[PDB]
CSV table of C-alpha atoms in Angstrom, one decimal:
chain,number,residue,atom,x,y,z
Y,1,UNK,CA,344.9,72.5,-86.8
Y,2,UNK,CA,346.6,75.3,-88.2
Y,3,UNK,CA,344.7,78.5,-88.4
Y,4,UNK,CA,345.2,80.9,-90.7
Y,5,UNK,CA,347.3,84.2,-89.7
Y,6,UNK,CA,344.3,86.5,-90.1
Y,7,UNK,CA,342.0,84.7,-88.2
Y,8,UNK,CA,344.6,84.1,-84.9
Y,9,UNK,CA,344.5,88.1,-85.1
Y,10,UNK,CA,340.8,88.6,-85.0
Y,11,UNK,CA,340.6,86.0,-82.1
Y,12,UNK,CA,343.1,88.4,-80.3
Y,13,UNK,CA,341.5,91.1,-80.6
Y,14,UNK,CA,338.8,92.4,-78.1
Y,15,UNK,CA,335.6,92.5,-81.0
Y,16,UNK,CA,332.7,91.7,-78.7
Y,17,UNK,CA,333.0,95.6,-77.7
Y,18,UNK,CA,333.3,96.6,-81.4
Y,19,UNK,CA,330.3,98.3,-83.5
Y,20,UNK,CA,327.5,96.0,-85.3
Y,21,UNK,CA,324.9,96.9,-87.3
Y,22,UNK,CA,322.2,95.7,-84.2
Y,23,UNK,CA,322.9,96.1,-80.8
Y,24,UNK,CA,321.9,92.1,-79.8
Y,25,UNK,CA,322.4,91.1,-76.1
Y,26,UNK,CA,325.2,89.5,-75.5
Y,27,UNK,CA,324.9,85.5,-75.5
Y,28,UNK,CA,327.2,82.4,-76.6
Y,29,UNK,CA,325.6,81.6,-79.8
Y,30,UNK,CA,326.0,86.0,-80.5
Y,31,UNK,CA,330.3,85.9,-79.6
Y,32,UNK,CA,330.4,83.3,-82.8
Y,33,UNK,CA,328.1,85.1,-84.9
Y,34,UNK,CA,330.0,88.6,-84.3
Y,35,UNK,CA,332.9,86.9,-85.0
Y,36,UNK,CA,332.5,85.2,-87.8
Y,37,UNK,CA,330.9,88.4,-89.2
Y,38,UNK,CA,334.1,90.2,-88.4
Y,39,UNK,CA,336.2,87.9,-90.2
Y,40,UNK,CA,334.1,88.0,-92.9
Y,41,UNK,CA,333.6,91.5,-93.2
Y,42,UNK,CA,337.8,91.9,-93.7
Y,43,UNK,CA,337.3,89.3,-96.6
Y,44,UNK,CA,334.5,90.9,-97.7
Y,45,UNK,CA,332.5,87.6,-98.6
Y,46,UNK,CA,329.7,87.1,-96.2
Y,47,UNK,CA,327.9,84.8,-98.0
Y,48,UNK,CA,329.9,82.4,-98.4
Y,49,UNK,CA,330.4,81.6,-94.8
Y,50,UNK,CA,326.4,81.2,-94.8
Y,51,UNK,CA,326.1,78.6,-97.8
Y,52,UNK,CA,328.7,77.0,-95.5
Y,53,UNK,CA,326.4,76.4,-92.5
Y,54,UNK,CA,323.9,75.1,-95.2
Y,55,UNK,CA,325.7,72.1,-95.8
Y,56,UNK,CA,327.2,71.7,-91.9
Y,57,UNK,CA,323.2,70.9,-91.4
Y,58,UNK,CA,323.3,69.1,-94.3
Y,59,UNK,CA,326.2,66.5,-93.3
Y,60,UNK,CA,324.7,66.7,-89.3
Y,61,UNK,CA,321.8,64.7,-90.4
Y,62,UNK,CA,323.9,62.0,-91.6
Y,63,UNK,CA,326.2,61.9,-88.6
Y,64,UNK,CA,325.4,59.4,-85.7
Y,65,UNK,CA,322.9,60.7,-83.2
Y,66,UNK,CA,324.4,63.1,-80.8
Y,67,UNK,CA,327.7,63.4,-82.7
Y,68,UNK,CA,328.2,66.8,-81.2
Y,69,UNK,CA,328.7,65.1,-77.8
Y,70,UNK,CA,331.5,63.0,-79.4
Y,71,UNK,CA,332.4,65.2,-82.5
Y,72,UNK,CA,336.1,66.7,-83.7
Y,73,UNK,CA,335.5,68.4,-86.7
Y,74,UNK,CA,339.3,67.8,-87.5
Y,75,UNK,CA,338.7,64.3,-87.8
Y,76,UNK,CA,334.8,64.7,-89.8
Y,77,UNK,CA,335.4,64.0,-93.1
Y,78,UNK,CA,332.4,66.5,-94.6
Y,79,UNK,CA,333.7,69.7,-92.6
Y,80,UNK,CA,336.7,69.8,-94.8
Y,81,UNK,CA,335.0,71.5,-97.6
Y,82,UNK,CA,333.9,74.2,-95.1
Y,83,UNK,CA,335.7,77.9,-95.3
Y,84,UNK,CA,338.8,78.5,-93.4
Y,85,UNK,CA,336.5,81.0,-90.7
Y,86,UNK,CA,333.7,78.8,-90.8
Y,87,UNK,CA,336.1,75.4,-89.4
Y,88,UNK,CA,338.0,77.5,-86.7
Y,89,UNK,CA,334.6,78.1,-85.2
Y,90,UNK,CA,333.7,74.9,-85.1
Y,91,UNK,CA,337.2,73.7,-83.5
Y,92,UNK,CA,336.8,76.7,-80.9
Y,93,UNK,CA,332.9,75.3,-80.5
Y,94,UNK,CA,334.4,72.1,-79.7
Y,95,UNK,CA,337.4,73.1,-77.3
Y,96,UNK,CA,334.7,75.0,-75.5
Y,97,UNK,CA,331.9,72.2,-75.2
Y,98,UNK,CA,329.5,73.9,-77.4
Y,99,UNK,CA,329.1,72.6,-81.1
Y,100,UNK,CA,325.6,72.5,-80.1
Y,101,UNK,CA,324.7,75.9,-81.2
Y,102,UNK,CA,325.8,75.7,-84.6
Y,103,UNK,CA,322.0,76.3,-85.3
Y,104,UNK,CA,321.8,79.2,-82.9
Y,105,UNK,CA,324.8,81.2,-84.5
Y,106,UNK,CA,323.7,80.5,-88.4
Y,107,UNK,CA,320.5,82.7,-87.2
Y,108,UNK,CA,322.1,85.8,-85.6
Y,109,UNK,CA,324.7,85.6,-88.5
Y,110,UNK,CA,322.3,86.4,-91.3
Y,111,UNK,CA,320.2,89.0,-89.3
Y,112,UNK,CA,323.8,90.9,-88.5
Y,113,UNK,CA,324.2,90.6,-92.8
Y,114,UNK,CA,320.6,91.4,-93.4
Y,115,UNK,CA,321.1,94.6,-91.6
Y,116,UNK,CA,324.0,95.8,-92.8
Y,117,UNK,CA,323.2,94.0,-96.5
Y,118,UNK,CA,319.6,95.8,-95.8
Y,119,UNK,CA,316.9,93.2,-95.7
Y,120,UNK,CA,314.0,92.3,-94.0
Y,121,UNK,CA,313.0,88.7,-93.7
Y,122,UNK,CA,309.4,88.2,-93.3
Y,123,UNK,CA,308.7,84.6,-91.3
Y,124,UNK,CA,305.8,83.5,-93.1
Y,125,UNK,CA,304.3,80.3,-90.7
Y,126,UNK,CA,301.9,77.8,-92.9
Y,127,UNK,CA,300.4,74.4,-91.5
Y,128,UNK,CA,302.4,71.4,-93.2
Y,129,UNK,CA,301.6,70.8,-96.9
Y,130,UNK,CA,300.0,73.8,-97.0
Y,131,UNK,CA,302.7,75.9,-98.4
Y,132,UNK,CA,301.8,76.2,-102.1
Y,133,UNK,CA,299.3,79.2,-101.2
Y,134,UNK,CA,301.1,81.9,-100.2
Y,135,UNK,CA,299.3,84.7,-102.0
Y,136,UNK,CA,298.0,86.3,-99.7
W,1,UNK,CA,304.2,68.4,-20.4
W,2,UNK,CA,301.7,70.1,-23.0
W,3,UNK,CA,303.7,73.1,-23.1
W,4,UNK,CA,307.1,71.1,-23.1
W,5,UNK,CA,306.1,68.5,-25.8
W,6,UNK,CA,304.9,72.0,-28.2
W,7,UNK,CA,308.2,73.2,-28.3
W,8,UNK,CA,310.1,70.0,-28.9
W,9,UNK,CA,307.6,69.5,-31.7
W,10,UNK,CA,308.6,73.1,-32.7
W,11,UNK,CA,311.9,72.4,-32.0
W,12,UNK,CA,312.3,69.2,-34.5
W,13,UNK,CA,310.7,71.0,-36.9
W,14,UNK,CA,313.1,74.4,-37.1
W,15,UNK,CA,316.2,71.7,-36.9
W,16,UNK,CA,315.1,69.9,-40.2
W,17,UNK,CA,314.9,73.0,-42.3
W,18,UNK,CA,317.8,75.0,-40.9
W,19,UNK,CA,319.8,72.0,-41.4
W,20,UNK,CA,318.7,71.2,-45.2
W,21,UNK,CA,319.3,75.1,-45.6
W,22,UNK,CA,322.3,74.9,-44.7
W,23,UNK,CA,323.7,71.8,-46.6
W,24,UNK,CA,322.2,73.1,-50.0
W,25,UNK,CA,323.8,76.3,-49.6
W,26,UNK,CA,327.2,74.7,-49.9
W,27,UNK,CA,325.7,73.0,-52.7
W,28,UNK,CA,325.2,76.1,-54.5
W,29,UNK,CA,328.4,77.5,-54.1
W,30,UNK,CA,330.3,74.6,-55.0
W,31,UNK,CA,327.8,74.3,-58.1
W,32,UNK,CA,327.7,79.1,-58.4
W,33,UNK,CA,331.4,78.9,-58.2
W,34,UNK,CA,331.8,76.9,-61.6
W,35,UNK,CA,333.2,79.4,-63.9
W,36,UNK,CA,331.9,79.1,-67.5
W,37,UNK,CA,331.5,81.1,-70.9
W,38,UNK,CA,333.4,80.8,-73.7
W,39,UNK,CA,337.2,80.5,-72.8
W,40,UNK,CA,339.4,82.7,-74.8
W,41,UNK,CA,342.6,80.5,-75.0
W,42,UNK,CA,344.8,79.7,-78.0
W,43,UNK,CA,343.4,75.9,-78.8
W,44,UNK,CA,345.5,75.5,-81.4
W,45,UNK,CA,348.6,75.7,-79.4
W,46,UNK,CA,348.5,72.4,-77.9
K,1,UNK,CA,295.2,98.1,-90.2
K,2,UNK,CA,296.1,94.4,-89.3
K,3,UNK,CA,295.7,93.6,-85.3
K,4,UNK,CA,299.3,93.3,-85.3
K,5,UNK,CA,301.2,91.5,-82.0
K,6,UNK,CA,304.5,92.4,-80.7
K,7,UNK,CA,306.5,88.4,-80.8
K,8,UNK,CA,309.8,88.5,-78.4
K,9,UNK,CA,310.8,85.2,-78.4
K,10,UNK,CA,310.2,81.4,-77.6
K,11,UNK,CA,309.9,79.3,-74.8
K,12,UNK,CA,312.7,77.3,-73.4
K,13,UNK,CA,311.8,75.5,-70.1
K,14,UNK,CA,308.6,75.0,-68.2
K,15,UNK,CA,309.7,74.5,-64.9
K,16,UNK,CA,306.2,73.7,-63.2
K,17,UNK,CA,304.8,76.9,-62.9
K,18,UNK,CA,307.6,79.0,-63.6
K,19,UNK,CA,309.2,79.4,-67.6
K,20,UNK,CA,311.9,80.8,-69.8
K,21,UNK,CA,312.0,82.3,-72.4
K,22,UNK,CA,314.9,82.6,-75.4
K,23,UNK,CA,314.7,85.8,-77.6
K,24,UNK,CA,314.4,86.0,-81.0
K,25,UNK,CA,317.7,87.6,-82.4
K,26,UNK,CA,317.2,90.8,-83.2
K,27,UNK,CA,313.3,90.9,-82.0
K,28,UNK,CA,311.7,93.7,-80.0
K,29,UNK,CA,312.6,92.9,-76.5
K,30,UNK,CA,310.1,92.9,-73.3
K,31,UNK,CA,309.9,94.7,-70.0
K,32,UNK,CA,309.5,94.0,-66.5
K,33,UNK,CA,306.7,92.6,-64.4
K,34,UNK,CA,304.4,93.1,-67.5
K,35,UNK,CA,302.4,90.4,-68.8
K,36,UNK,CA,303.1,88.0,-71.9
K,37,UNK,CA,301.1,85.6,-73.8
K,38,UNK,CA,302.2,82.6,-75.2
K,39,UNK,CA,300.3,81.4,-77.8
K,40,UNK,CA,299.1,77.7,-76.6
K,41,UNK,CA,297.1,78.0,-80.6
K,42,UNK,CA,297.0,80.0,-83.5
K,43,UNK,CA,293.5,81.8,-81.3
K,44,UNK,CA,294.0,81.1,-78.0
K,45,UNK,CA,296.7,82.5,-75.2
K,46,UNK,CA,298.2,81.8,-72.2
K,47,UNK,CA,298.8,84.6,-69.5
K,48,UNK,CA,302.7,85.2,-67.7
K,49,UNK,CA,304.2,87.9,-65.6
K,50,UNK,CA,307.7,88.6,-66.6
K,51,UNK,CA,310.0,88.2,-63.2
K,52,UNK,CA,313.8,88.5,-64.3
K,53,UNK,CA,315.6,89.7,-67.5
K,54,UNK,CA,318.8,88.2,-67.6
K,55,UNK,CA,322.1,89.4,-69.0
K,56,UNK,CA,321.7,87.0,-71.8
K,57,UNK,CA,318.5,88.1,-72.8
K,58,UNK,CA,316.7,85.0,-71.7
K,59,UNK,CA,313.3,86.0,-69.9
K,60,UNK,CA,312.2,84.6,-66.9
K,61,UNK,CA,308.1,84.4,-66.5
K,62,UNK,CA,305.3,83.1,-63.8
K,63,UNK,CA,303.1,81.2,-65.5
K,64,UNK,CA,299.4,82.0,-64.8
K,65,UNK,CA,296.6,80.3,-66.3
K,66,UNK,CA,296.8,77.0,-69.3
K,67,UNK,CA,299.3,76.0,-67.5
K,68,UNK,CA,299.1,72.6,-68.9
K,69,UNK,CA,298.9,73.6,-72.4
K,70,UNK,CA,301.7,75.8,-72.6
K,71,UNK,CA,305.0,74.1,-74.4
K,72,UNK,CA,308.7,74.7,-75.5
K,73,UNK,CA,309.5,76.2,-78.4
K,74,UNK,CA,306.0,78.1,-78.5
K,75,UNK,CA,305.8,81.6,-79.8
K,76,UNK,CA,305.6,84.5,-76.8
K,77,UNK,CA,303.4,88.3,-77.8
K,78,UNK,CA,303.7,90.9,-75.6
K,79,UNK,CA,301.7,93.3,-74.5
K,80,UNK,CA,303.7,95.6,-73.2
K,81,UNK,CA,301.3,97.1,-70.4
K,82,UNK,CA,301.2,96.1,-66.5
K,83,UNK,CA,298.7,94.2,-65.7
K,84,UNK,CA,295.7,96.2,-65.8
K,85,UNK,CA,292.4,93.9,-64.9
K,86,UNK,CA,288.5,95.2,-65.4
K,87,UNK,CA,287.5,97.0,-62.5
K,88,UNK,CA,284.1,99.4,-61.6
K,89,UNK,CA,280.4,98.7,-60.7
K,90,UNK,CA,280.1,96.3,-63.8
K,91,UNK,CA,281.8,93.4,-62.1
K,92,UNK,CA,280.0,93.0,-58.9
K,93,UNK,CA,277.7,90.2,-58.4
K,94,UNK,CA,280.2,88.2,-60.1
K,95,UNK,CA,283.1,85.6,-59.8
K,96,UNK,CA,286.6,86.2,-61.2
K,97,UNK,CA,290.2,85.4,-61.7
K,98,UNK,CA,292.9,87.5,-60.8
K,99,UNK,CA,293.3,88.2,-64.8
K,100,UNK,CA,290.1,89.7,-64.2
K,101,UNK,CA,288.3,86.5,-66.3
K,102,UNK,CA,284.7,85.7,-65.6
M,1,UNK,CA,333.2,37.9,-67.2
M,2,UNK,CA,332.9,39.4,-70.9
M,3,UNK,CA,334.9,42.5,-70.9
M,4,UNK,CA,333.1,43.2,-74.2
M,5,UNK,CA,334.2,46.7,-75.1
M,6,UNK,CA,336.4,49.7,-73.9
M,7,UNK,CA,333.6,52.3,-72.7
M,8,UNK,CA,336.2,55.3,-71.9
M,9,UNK,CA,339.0,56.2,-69.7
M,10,UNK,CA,339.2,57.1,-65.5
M,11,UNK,CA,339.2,60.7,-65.4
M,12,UNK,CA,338.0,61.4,-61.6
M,13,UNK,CA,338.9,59.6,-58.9
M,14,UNK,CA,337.2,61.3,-55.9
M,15,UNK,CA,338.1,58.6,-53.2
M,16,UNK,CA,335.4,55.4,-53.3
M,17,UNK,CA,334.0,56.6,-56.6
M,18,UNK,CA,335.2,57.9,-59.8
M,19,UNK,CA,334.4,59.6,-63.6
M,20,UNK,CA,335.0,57.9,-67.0
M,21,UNK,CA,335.8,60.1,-70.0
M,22,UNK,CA,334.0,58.4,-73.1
M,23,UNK,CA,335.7,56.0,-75.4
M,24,UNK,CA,336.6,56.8,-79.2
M,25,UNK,CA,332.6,56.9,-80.5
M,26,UNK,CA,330.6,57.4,-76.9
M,27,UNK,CA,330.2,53.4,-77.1
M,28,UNK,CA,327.8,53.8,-73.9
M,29,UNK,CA,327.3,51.4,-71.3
M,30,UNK,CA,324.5,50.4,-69.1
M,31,UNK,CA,322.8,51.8,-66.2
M,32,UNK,CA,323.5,49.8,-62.9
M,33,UNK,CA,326.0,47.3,-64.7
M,34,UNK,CA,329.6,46.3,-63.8
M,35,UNK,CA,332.6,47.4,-64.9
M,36,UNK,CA,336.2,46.6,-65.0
M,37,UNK,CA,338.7,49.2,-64.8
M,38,UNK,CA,342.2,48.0,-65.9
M,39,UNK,CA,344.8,48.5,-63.1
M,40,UNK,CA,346.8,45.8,-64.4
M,41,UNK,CA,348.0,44.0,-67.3
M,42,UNK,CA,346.1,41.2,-66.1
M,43,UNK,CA,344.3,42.3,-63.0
M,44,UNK,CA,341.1,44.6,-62.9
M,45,UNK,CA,339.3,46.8,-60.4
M,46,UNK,CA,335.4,46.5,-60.8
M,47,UNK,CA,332.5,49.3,-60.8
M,48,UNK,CA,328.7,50.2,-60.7
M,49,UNK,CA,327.5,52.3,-63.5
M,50,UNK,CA,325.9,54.9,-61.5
M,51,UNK,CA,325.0,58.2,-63.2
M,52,UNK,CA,325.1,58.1,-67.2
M,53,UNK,CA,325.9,61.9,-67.9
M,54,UNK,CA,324.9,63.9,-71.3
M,55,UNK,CA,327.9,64.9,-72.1
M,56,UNK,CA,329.1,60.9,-72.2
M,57,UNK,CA,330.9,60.9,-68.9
M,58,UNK,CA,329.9,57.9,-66.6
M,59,UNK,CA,329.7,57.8,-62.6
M,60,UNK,CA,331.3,54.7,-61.1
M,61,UNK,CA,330.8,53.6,-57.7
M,62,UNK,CA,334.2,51.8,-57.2
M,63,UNK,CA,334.0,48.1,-55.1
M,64,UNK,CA,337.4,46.5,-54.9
M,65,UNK,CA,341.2,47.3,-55.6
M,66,UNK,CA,340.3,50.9,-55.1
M,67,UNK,CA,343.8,51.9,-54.0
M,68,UNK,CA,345.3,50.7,-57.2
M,69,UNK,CA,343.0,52.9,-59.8
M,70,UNK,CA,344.0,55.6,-61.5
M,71,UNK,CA,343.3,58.4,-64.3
M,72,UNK,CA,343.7,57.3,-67.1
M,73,UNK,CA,343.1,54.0,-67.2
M,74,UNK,CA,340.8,51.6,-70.0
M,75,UNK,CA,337.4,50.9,-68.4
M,76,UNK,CA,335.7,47.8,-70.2
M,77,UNK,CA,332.2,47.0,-69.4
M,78,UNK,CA,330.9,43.4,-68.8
M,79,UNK,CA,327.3,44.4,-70.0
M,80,UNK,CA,325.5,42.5,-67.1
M,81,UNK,CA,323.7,43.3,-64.1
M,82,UNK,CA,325.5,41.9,-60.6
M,83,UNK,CA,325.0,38.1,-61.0
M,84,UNK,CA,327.0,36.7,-57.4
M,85,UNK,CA,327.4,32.5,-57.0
M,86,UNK,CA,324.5,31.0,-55.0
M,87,UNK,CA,323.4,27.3,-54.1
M,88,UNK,CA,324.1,24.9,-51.2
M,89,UNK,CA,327.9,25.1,-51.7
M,90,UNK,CA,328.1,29.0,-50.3
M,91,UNK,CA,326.8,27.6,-46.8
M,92,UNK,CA,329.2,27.6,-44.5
M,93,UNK,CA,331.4,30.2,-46.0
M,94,UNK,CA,332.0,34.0,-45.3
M,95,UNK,CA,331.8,35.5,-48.4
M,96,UNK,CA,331.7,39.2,-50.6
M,97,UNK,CA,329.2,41.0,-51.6
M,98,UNK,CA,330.2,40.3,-55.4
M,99,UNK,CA,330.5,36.8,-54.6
M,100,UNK,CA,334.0,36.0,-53.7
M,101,UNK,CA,334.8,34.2,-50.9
């Protein structure tokens, strides 16, 4: 692999102890999520690193049942259209035995935008099928 | 003999769990001392 | 004017009687050796006493009563009170729990 | 023997027993099947599969040429429970646990 300039600065740099827009307790799947929000804050694109993890769950469901045990993302051939912050976190997931919270980070990610982009996401739980009601 | 064969009873009993005490715990610091997190290292290079 | 619930997070293990549970990122957060309720259903509730916050946010409960019923990845409320049971000269002659449950 | 496949790679070798690093694809092997771990060019150890770990590693109890395996080396799996020799012709001879004599 051969990351980018930019992002071997960032992962240099001591940014768990830097200000967020929520103060979230420290946790494995919260280090990726502040820094891929860091990263993507110096872009200044935070959505696309989000439409990213849309189709990372998109290609897991093909992959072969626990890939993540067995998975290098430089050899998938689907996580090549990923961002360039988006696949180092992956290859630092895998180095460090933990590609399994992919799912976990995509969460804290979008509440750390939502804050700071200002919104509030409303969880709205409906028995199966019945989704086309949601009125009230 | 009824006050003899009470405290080898009590005596076989007190050896079986200070001795499984003891042996699990080694087992947790052999399994406590196994650092983890998220290693901060420079993957790439290697 | 909705009876609105306090929801910290999920659960994670069920260890027998004891449990864990995951926070929600970004969700209220709980405090100690008050009482949670997992929500077995949509009505009823199952009772725990919060024992250990961890540095990772991960809560640590004693399970009390439906133990059976209770399941990972269920939804946790909290009340956000110590456990405070029914108590005075309208309870005797009569059988409870220690939740204070006829 | 069918050494079918190559399972993974030694990785441990903590005396009698040892740890196997999964092969390209976790092919998996078998609980309480044998194994053949190749010392040699033409000459192999053999193993019990043991504990069959999450992350893909497998435990191996080791049971012969156990001075001669190292990490490192191809472990192909045979696929088969411990099947030894028996009949009238193994009387009157001192023989191994897996069968040889």
């Amino acid at each position: 692999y051969t990351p980018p300039e930019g992002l071997k600065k960032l992962y240099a740099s001591d940014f768990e102890n830097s200000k967020y827009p929520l103060n979230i307790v420290p946790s494995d799947s919260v280090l990726f999520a502040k820094f891929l929000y860091k990263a993507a804050e110096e872009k200044g694109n935070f959505d696309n690193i989000l439409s990213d993890f849309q189709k990372i769950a998109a290609a897991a469901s093909k992959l072969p049942i626990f890939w993540e045990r067995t998975a290098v993302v430089e050899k998938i051939p689907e996580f090549k259209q990923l961002s360039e912050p988006t696949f180092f976190t992956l290859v630092w997931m895998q180095n460090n035995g933990m590609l399994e919270l992919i799912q976990e980070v995509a969460e804290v990610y979008e509440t750390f935008v939502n804050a700071k982009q200002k919104k509030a996401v409303a969880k709205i739980f409906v028995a199966p099928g019945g989704e086309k009601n949601v009125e009230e | 003999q009824q006050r003899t064969s009470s405290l080898y009873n009590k005596t076989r009993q007190f050896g079986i769990t200070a001795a499984l005490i003891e042996i699990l715990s080694a087992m947790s610091s052999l399994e406590g001392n196994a650092m983890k997190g998220v290693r901060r290292n420079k993957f790439w290079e290697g | 004017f909705f009876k609105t619930t306090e929801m910290i997070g999920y659960v994670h293990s069920i260890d027998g009687t004891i449990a864990t549970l995951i926070p929600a990122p970004g969700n209220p957060g709980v405090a100690y050796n008050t009482i949670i309720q997992i929500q077995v259903s949509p009505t009823t509730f199952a009772a725990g006493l919060v024992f250990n916050l961890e540095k990772d946010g991960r809560i640590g409960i004693i399970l009390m009563d439906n133990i059976t019923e209770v399941q990972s990845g269920q939804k946790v409320m909290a009340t956000g009170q110590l456990l405070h049971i029914p108590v005075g000269a309208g309870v005797l002659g009569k059988v409870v729990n220690p939740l204070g449950h006829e």
